[PDB]
Amino acid sequence: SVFDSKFKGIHVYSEIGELESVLVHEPGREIDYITPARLDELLFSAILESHDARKEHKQFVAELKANDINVVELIDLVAETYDLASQEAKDKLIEEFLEDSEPVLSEEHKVVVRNFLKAKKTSRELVEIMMAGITKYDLGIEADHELIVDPMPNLYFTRDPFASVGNGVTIHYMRYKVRQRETLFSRFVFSNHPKLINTPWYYDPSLKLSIEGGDVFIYNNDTLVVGVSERTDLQTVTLLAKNIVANKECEFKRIVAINVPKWTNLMHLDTWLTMLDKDKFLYSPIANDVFKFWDYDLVNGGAEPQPVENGLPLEGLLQSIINKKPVLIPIAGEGASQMEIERETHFDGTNYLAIRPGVVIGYSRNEKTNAALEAAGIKVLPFHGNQLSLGMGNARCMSMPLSRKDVKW
Amino acid sequence: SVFDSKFKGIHVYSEIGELESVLVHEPGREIDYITPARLDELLFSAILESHDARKEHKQFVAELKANDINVVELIDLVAETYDLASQEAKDKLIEEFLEDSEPVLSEEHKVVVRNFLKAKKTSRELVEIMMAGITKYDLGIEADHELIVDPMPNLYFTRDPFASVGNGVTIHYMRYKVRQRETLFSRFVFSNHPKLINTPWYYDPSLKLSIEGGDVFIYNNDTLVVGVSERTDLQTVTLLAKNIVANKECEFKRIVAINVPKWTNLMHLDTWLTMLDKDKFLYSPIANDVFKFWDYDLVNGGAEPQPVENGLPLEGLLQSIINKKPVLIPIAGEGASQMEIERETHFDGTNYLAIRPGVVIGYSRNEKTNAALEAAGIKVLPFHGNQLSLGMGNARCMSMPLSRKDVKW
Ligand SMILES: *[C@@]([N])(=O)[N][C][C][C][C]([N])C([O])=O
Ligand SMILES: *[C@@]([N])(=O)[N][C][C][C][C]([N])C([O])=O
Numbered sequence A, B: 001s002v003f004d005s006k007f008k009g010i011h012v013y014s015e016i017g018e019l020e021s022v023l024v025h026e027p028g029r030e031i032d033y034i035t036p037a038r039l040d041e042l043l044f045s046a047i048l049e050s051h052d053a054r055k056e057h058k059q060f061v062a063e064l065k066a067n068d069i070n071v072v073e074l075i076d077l078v079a080e081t082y083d084l085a086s087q088e089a090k091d092k093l094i095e096e097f098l099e100d101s102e103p104v105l106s107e108e109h110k111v112v113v114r115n116f117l118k119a120k121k122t123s124r125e126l127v128e129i130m131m132a133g134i135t136k137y138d139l140g141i142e143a144d145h146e147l148i149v150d151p152m153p154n155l156y157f158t159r160d161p162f163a164s165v166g167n168g169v170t171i172h173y174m175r176y177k178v179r180q181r182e183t184l185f186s187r188f189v190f191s192n193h194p195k196l197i198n199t200p201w202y203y204d205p206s207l208k209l210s211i212e213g214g215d216v217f218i219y220n221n222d223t224l225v226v227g228v229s230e231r232t233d234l235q236t237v238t239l240l241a242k243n244i245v246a247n248k249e250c251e252f253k254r255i256v257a258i259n260v261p262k263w264t265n266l267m268h269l270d271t272w273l274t275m276l277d278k279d280k281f282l283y284s285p286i287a288n289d290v291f292k293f294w295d296y297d298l299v300n301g302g303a304e305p306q307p308v309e310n311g312l313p314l315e316g317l318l319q320s321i322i323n324k325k326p327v328l329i330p331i332a333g334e335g336a337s338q339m340e341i342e343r344e345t346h347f348d349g350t351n352y353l354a355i356r357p358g359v360v361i362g363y364s365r366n367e368k369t370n371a372a373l374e375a376a377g378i379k380v381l382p383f384h385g386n387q388l389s390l391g392m393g394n395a396r397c398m399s400m401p402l403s404r405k406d407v408k409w
Helices: A029-033 A036-042 A050-066 A074-083 A087-099 A107-118 A123-132 A183-192 A234-246 A314-322 A338-346 A367-375 B029-033 B036-042 B050-065 B074-084 B087-099 B107-119 B123-132 B183-192 B234-246 B314-322 B338-346 B367-375
Strands: A019-024 A070-073 A147-149 A162-165 A168-171 A201-203 A216-218 A223-228 A254-259 A273-277 A280-283 A292-297 A327-330 A353-356 A359-363 A379-383 A400-404 B019-024 B070-073 B147-149 B162-165 B168-171 B201-203 B216-218 B223-228 B254-259 B273-277 B280-283 B292-297 B308-310 B327-330 B353-356 B359-363 B379-383 B400-404
Touching: A019 A050, A019 A074, A019 A353, A029 A050, A029 A123, A036 B338, A050 A070, A050 A359, A050 A379, A070 A074, A074 A123, A074 A183, A087 A107, A087 A183, A107 A123, A107 A147, A123 A183, A162 A183, A162 A216, A162 A400, A168 A183, A201 A234, A223 A234, A234 A254, A234 A292, A273 A353, A314 A327, A327 A367, A338 A367, A338 B036, A359 A367, A367 A379, B019 B050, B019 B074, B019 B353, B029 B050, B029 B123, B050 B070, B050 B359, B050 B379, B070 B074, B074 B123, B074 B183, B087 B107, B087 B183, B107 B123, B107 B147, B123 B183, B162 B183, B162 B216, B162 B400, B168 B183, B201 B234, B223 B234, B234 B254, B234 B292, B273 B353, B314 B327, B327 B367, B338 B367, B359 B367, B367 B379
Parallel strands: A019 A070, A168 A201, A223 A254, A280 A327, A359 A379, B019 B070, B168 B201, B223 B254, B280 B327, B359 B379
Antiparallel strands: A019 A400, A162 A168, A216 A223, A254 A292, A273 A280, A353 A359, B019 B400, B162 B168, B216 B223, B254 B292, B273 B280, B292 B308, B353 B359
C-alpha cells in the first residue's frame, strides 16, 4: 500500500505538527500540453521545462522522505483504490470523467474515449491518461483539434482539490473548470479506499460555492482559518461553518476568515500568510492594508453561524488564536526593498510547508525570505524548484498533509 | 585587452564562418530590478532566477571558449575603452547617460547621479552601475520611488543594439526606450576603441527609424537579409539600403527583406528563420503563410533603392541567394504536433548561433528541435539556459559576432 502501517486515517489538527503522511503528485504528461496561447486559461505564469520540473519534484519528495515522512503519490493512491474498488465504482469513475470532460465530448468521441480508457491494460495507465489528457493521436482518429480531452496540468498542486480538516475532509468546488476536474480523484479515493472511507466530509463539489485548499488552515484543535481570496468566497466559508456545526463528531470551535488581495497569481491565503511554528507567522507586507477578518462561532453561534467582523490588527488577531505573543516575519526580511518584497512575494515566498514545528521546506530561490526565516529561528530545508515555481505555487501548494503528530502546545 | 592578438576589426561576411571573436554580456544587477508589474514594460516573459541565470550564461561562454573563440564581455570592453578614451569622451559618456535616462531625471537628481558616477573609483564600477540601474539606496537619498535610473535588463541580448555588417556596423534606433538606452555603449566603444574606431557605420541611433540586430543576417559577401518584424520596419531597411549605397567601400550588392509574424514575444526574424550551414536553414512552420519578400538592388537601383516584391516561395527565395537548393528544417522536426511546434517555437527554437558551418549552440530545452538538427547533419552543442530563455531569446540573441573566418562556399 501507498500508506505505511501506522497510517490510520486523516488526522490533521495543526499546520505544524510532525508530518507523518503527505499527498503529492509529480507533474506527469499533463504539463507537456501547456501551450503559449493557453497559459492564462491553464493557470500558469509561463511554460515549465518538463524534464527539470519532474527532477525538481523528485528532490522535493526526497527531502520529505529523508525526514521519515510517508510520501503518497496521487497516481498510485488512485490506482490502488481502483484495484480494490467495486466494478460499479470502477465504471462510474470512467463515466464521471467523461461527463465532466473539458472540452465537452460529442457522443461519438465519448464512445471512442470510453473504449480507449477501458482498453488500458493497467490501473496506473488508466489513471495516468485521465490526468494527462487525451489527444486525437492517442485515439487514432481525425479531429479538428488535437486535445480531445484537456490535460489537468495543475494536479501537482495537491494542496487545492481537497483539504484534511482534523479527522474530516473538505472536497472542494474549485473556481475554474480546469481544476474542478481534479476533484474527481479526490471523491474517488475517499469514497473507496479502506483507510479513507470512514472520513467524514465537511464539503463536497456538488455545493457549487467556490473554495480551495490553499485557503484552508488548521491552526489548532479549536480554530480553523480560511482565506477569502481569488478562489474562496466568504459565503462559501459561511456554508462550511454551517456544515461543520451540522457534524456532531467534529470538534472545531471557531473559524477565522481572512481577506486577502484578490490577485490571480497569488490566489490563496497561503500566498500571503502562513503559520510555520507554534508562534511564528510568515506574511507579505503587500497585503498590509487589505487584511480583514471575520469570526465564526461554531459553538454558540446557532446552526448557521455568520461572519462577525473582527477589527483587531493582524498581530492581535493571531494572538487571539494561539494565546501567546505571535512573531510576524515579513517576506524578504526587515530592511528589504519593495522590489525584493514584490519579487519574493511573487514566487510564493510565504508558501512554505512546515514538516515539524519551526522546520520548513520551500524553494531555494527566495533567498532573502529564507535568510529571514533562519534569523527568526526557523530551520529551512531548501530544494531547487525554479521550473515548478512557474506554476505559481511553492511547497505548501504541492502538498496535502494526511496526518500530523500532535503538537505539544 | 578583451580582444585577442589576432582581432583586427569587424569581419563578418556570413552567418556561419568559424567564429573568432564574439560579444556577449553576462546579466548583471540589472535583472534583479525586474518586478512583476513591469514584465511587459521591461520585455520579459517572466522573472528570472538571477543566480541560475548567471550560471547558465557562464556555461554558454564556457562552451564558446572550448571552441577556440575570443569571447568579449561588454562590461570589460566598455571599461577598457573608457580607460583609454579622451577626457572629453569620458565626460560625454556620463552626460549622454544622464540625458537619456529613464525615467527622466529632475535637475536635482541629475546632479546627485552625476556626482555619484564620477565618484566611482574604477571604470568597471562605473560601467556596471550604468548598466544595472540606480536606486535611491545606492545614492543615499530620500525619494518617492526606489529606482532613480532604470536598469537596462536586456543588455545580455547583445545581438540587438548593433550588428556587424561585413567590415562595417549598424548601430540601431531600437523600438523601445528600455533598450534604446543600451546603444549608448555601442556608440561609445565604436567611437573610441582603437580596434573599432575605423569601422564604418551604415546606421546610427539618430536616424529614428526602428531596426534591431536580431533582424540582421549576413548571408554572404553579396547578400544581406533583414527582417520586417515587430522591431524592424521595411521603411528602415529602405533607409539602410540608401546608406549602404552611399558608402563606396561597402561591397554588399543586395538586401532581401523578409516579412515575419509581428509577435511581441518573437520579435525578430531570427525567431522565425536562421541559416546554420552553407545550405541548411531552421524555420518555424507557424510563419508559413506570413513570410513575404522584397529585394533591394544595391548596385543598379540608383541612390535610393526601393523594395521590389519577390514572389518566390521560401525555398525558391533562399535558392536565389545561395544558388543551391536549400534544406529547410522545421521546428520540432517532422511529424511534431502543433503543441510541440508552438512550444519550441515559443522558446526561440529557431535561434541558434552557428560557430562554424553545421555546428551550433542553443538551449537544451528544445529537445525535438535539437533532434531534428542532428538528424539533418548539424552538430548541436547544447547548454542549459532555462532562466535565460525567460527573456525571450536564445544563443543567437545573446551574441554578436565581431569576426568570422571566410567561408569556403
Ligand atoms: C497554492 N496552494 O496557493 N496553490 C497554487 C496553485 C497554482 C495553480 N497554477 C492554480 O491553481 O492557479
Ligand atoms: C533575439 N535577437 O531574437 N532577441 C531577443 C531579445 C529579447 C528581449 N527581452 C527584447 O528585446 O524583447
